[PDB]
């Protein structure tokens, strides 16, 4: 006890009970990360060496008109996309919204020696910093910069892939939490270099 | 007495029962109750991570009951609510601490002091983490002791001084 | 009295005295709503079954260059337009700024059975939710959803029309108030589905 | 003594006269005056709808006098002022309550307690509405009584304890 | 005791040494120290220009030490920090006062009262300017005297009342 | 002293010590204004009667891809540009980013009698109001409107020129201060007329 009579006690919150109102971020490992979106469904976010979309096309505006997707899942994805620092297209994103499915891929793999040398930009900086905000408590794939000393990071991965999935227990490395989404949602001021 | 952080009028918080956290708010304990004297501090606070979680839980409670079968959350209801419900500055402070390798709140564990003779407790404060682990009691012992003193002052200044 | 000696008393503010600094929202009935903009002038906002603009054109950028309009009235209208959730053009708005007049019309009437089934989008969701924020204390034309249980609404009306008008007493259903405008003005974070 | 919520330095609020609401602020009464002790709470408050209306009125007063013949309001002056003057979070909380069918402030009537022997009054709080009407005293009686107790404490703790 | 406005945990502020401003924070004095009782007010304050400068200095201290050789500031680190560190509403209030010809804080000089027998000092408040010059003591004498009274009350209410 | 025992004392902060984290605004005279950006470098902002860029072109997006500039200097310039009230291009800005240099020029000189009569717009209003926010404590070139009674200003100057410079003592009329930049950075809500 502290000062004779105070016992230190611990409270820990179960944020899974918030799943009907807020999306909840989770982590499974160094690559897989998750967002619970509904009671049964959510998004899977992965970091890989393998491209699954070989398209250089997205045609997002046609996908939107097609309107065969869950608006909640789409809303979260577009939240992510438009929260990217130094937002622009830079090509970068290819997608597939045929039917009602969702598959979105970012070309982090863009990085080559000249842009690697610049570090603080060229698509990967903005995508990775958004990923890290969605993923609070996730795996800090900043590697040698894992505790965040520096704010420009690079990863070994080539692609960030976001897909519509089934909610199953994952959350092996972190507690479900609304903070990631809320962070991205509230941080809407100015964060660009080019416009 | 009453709270300012709830959305619901009176029903959100009654005076005589204090304020309780149920089994769906907590992970291991079935029930934890705090006196309104401490919980009411969130009526005024511009800080304390605990108070944002407390507001998000109140929101979830009302949102579910009001929108019968919320089915798939609409997202737009919560986005408006977020601007109304949480301290964005506070999330950003913890974000800054996460970056730059400074112990920060990851919104999981909270700690509080509980008197061993009486039932008085403090408002919970976030247990911080660093390098993937929780900080020891010896690193944040200054705050634990300060909290104990604050509770002592409140116990002593009862009715009149 | 309360506790023997406290009398409960009522204070009510006259917000019309704020008309030289802030625009003031008002309501007349289920359709007509108003904004006082100046000492003598303001905007009329109506919900109707009759189109007054048969144009599929707005040419807002040419109207802006023409520059024969009151900047204050235009500023309020563009505040409204750019505050629309899921903002895009979607055609949606037609206008007429010939001379110095203002007439702006939104195609809420777009709604047909497929989009009606979707509810949470397709122009009307975004326009109606902006209208309701401008109109605090106005007529809650959400109809069966009048107290706002649910956040996706539909109305019987086909068009939202905004016009330059003369300030005359209206304000039959509500108190003049700066809150509507202030609400829209301060709520500038993120509220989209498509971008 | 002085206020922090005014823009004007000293002229915005004098200590000895208390703070008064004139006939152009109020609808039915020609004059209502509050002690600075209660009004000064808006110096600190992050809540209370009354305090935003109070700031908007101070702004209007200065804006008119400074910009001789403001003619047609420029809009851009107020837009900047809004970010400086009001609690946006609070408007959004009332917006959330309006939606979801929860009693909310529509910024019209406010209520306060007034002592029947002395001249002491509380800071006004927003009278809430629901389903187009004002709530009865019996629905918000918990807050009316809490306010009475708060006033009693202040009257009792005079000069020293 | 401890502070809530620092980013650093405990190291940011120790209790027994009070809180000091070094020669690189101040322009003319080599050293000025304030008691934690007054500095700690920034733990709660939603106002006082001094508290934002105080937070920016803490940020600068940590940012430099954490990012060894920050070289050229990245800008993006500070932009996120700004949302976490400062009172934006307060800058906008001073902006409004600058416009409309009202004395306003230009974040340079601050003033405080210092007791001539004991070492007690107040938290600094911004010295305002108007028409390119600092205001005289006679224009803001109401606040100087109010601050003196506030300090007197604190000195008198020592240990118990 | 006040109340017998309180001595009034003055504290003044040296904000130059913040130069490694935040850009610092300064003023030299009625025309020259400065921003310290790094330990050795910064931006010079001037008001002149002489154009140095005779181009009607900027080609900012090509400059960005060329990527021979300091990202910090560019970030500050784009902060300024995108903070302009009633933001649009309106032509207005011409630039030169050949090599690694920075030279940006705004056509304040656009103003002629019709637009001068309108006052509250037509490029100069937005550029000048951004300049004044960057320049807190700077020279209030609002002239007859120097204390800011009114919020629409005009200056005698024809061009606003921003260039990459060497930090040398300047700061003759003001204290280095992060407030200007912070003001522009945090003020991100809504401030347009046209969009
Ligand atoms: C704030 O930071 C804290 C840091 O502690 C996060 O809290 C949790 O921390 C623990 C580590 O102390 C995380 O890991 C857990 O380990 C338990 C034991 O692990 C052994 O057994 C497993 C078998 O699968 C081996 O792989 C491992 O190497 C060890 O030998 C596991 O039992 C935990 O749960 C697992 O099993 C259950 C089923 O019984 C599954 O449902 C789980 O998904 C999981 O597979 C767990 O792996 C722990 O993950 C951290 N999170 C949680 C939720 O407990 C806080 O989460 C963080 N805050 C936020 C918001 O993220
Ligand atoms: C917060 O919510 C409250 C809810 O009460 C709004 O306050 C006002 O509430 C009253 C209802 O109690 C509104 O209606 C008023 O009714 C009065 C009596 O109505 C009879 O007579 C009329 C004759 O025209 C009949 O149509 C009606 O059916 C009844 O038989 C009217 O006298 C009121 O004013 C009318 O006449 C005057 C001229 O004398 C005109 O200047 C008015 O514009 C109007 O035509 C009124 O109609 C009332 O409208 C609500 N608002 C106001 C301003 O009083 C609060 O307004 C709301 N807060 C905000 C910010 O909106
Ligand atoms: C908030 O508002 C205050 C207003 O007072 C600003 O504070 C400073 O105010 C003084 C005026 O009181 C400014 O001017 C200074 O004048 C001193 C004396 O001037 C004589 O000598 C010069 C010789 O160059 C003549 O040109 C002049 O006409 C007078 O005859 C100068 O000594 C000051 O410094 C100069 O010399 C030093 C080298 O010794 C250089 O390093 C300086 O850059 C400069 O050339 C100065 O000119 C003064 O500029 C104001 N600022 C500062 C930093 O002191 C606050 O700055 C303002 N707050 C903010 C955030 O801006
Ligand atoms: C997602 O959030 C919802 C809402 O918080 C969680 O649903 C809730 O589940 C609990 C049980 O775990 C329900 O509590 C009650 O349990 C008793 C028996 O113990 C039962 O008799 C009651 O009828 C009730 O079921 C609670 O009512 C229920 N809330 C609602 C409105 O559904 C859900 O479990 C969360 N999802 C996950 C994966 O945690
Ligand atoms: C729009 O706002 C303005 C400013 O609040 C209101 O103008 C004000 O009107 C009042 C009278 O109603 C003026 O008060 C004074 O009245 C006495 C006589 O009673 C007179 O002698 C004074 O000269 C003065 O007129 C007040 O000064 C005036 N303010 C200004 C600067 O114009 C206006 O009434 C509001 N509009 C509406 C529709 O309410
Ligand atoms: C820009 O900001 C940096 C950081 O605040 C300033 O650098 C600092 O300069 C001071 C000296 O003025 C250093 O203090 C120390 O001085 C003693 C001797 O007096 C010396 O023994 C120490 O080694 C140290 O140099 C301080 O450490 C240093 N901070 C760092 C990390 O560089 C810089 O002066 C500011 N620029 C301008 C133009 O003011
Ligand atoms: C870490 O994540 C990877 C995926 O990136 C896991 O490997 C595959 O996961 C999928 C989806 O669950 C399975 O269908 C595959 O069968 C897995 N691959 C193999 C070879 O089994 C990997 O197992 C995860 N690992 C941990 C926690 O060690
Ligand atoms: C985006 O649109 C292009 C349009 O060219 C699609 O590419 C295919 O183009 C050929 C003609 O060269 C058509 O016959 C195919 O039917 C088009 N495919 C599709 C799916 O429409 C491209 O595939 C589209 N990409 C996405 C993600 O929709
Ligand atoms: C495939 O995965 C590896 C990791 O297993 C990625 O890592 C890079 O590997 C190369 C070759 O050894 C090194 O030069 C890089 O420095 C590594 N990257 C980092 C951040 O350390 C590799 O990038 C992935 N993709 C490809 C196309 O090789
Ligand atoms: C409710 O609003 C409608 C308009 O949408 C009113 O009907 C017309 O209003 C205009 C404008 O004031 C008049 O010029 C027309 O003459 C009105 N129509 C008719 C047939 O008289 C309607 O009167 C309003 N009603 C209320 C409060 O009952
Ligand atoms: C927007 O521009 C179109 C341009 O075609 C306008 O339509 C008319 O086009 C015919 C030629 O086909 C011209 O002779 C008319 O003079 C044009 N009308 C006008 C008003 O310019 C359309 O009307 C314009 N719409 C708006 C709202 O300005
Ligand atoms: C014309 O006004 C009526 C209301 O008087 C609108 O209301 C719809 O009417 C149809 C036919 O009875 C119903 O099927 C719809 O369900 C009603 N809408 C709602 C929201 O209940 C009608 O939309 C208006 N316009 C047209 C072109 O008919
Ligand atoms: C005020 O600023 C102007 C520049 O706009 C100064 O004049 C020139 O400044 C440049 C840059 O330092 C020098 O290279 C030129 O030689 C200066 N011109 C002349 C004729 O000497 C001007 O000196 C500044 N003045 C003050 C404080 O009086
Ligand atoms: C923006 O691009 C135009 C492209 O026309 C540049 O103008 C020159 O155009 C001639 C052909 O008419 C070429 O031979 C020159 O090489 C072009 N100059 C340059 C620098 O590319 C214009 O100068 C460019 N402006 C900027 C600021 O880059
Ligand atoms: C050149 O500098 C002068 C100032 O020295 C600018 O000032 C204008 O001068 C004209 C002619 O006397 C006046 O009619 C304007 O009213 C002055 N402007 C203001 C705001 O007072 C002049 O604009 C500059 N440029 C040019 C091309 O003349
Ligand atoms: C994504 O949604 C589509 C809807 O047509 C479904 O067929 C597909 O299986 C879903 N994807 C996953 C991984 O469950
Ligand atoms: C604190 O240190 C003790 C002794 O090494 C250890 O047993 C305990 O688990 C530690 N607790 C935390 C939270 O680090
Ligand atoms: C709108 O402004 C024009 C200015 O040319 C005027 O002629 C017209 O009558 C005004 N409209 C209304 C409804 O008063
Ligand atoms: C409260 O109830 C009484 C009794 O029915 C009624 O006379 C009074 O008008 C009501 N007041 C309000 C504000 O509802
Ligand atoms: C205040 O007035 C006195 C007397 O005129 C003068 O000496 C002093 O410098 C003035 N101080 C300020 C800050 O204006
Ligand atoms: C701007 O940067 C370029 C880099 O190529 C340099 O050559 C030029 O001299 C710099 N401009 C100034 C005014 O120092």
Numbering used by the authors:
A (entry chain B), C (entry chain A), F (entry chain C): 60 to 254
B (entry chain b), D (entry chain a), E (entry chain c): 259 to 419
Give sentences from the paper:
The LASV glycoprotein complex (GPC) mediates viral entry and is the sole target for neutralizing antibodies. In its mature, native form, GPC is a trimer of heterotrimers comprised of the receptor-engaging subunit GP1; the transmembrane-spanning subunit GP2, which contains the GPC’s fusion peptide at its N terminus; and the stable signal peptide (SSP), which remains non-covalently complexed near the membrane-proximal region of GP2 post-cleavage. The GPC is expressed as a single polypeptide precursor before being proteolytically processed by signal peptidase (SPase)21 followed by site-1 protease (S1P). We present the development and characterization of prefusion-stabilized, trimeric GPCs of LASV lineages II, V, and VII, revealing structural conservation despite sequence diversity.
We focus on LASV lineages of public health concern including lineage II, one of the most common lineages that circulates widely in southern Nigeria; lineage V, which circulates in Mali and has decreased pathogenicity compared with lineage IV; and lineage VII, a newly described lineage isolated from a nosocomial infection in Togo with comparable pathogenicity to lineage IV. The resulting soluble constructs feature sequences of circulating lineages II (LII; strain NIG08-A41), V (LV; strain Soromba-R), and VII (LVII; strain Togo/2016/7082). Combined, these approaches enabled us to determine the structures of GPC in a reproducible manner and yielded structures of LIV, LII, LV, and LVII GPC trimers at resolutions of 3.8, 3.7, 3.7, and 3.1 Å, respectively. LII, LV, and LVII each have an additional PNGS at residue N271 or N272, though this site is uniformly unoccupied. Similarly, when comparing the GPCs of diverse lineages, we observe high structural homology. Using the prototypical LIV GPC as reference, we note RMSDs for pruned and all sequence-aligned pair as follows: 0.78 and 1.9 (LII), 0.85 and 2.0 (LV), and 0.73 and 2.4 Å (LVII). The main differences among the GPC lineages are found in flexible loops, most notably the loop (residues 166–181) extending from the β7 sheet prior to the α3 helix. This observed heterogeneity is derived from areas in the EM map of poorer local resolution, insinuating greater flexibility of the residues in these regions. Consequently, these differences may not represent physiologically important conformational epitopes for LII, LV, and LVII GPCs. We observed neutralization of viruses pseudotyped with GPCs from LII, LIII, and LIV by both 12.1F and 19.7E, consistent with the binding data.
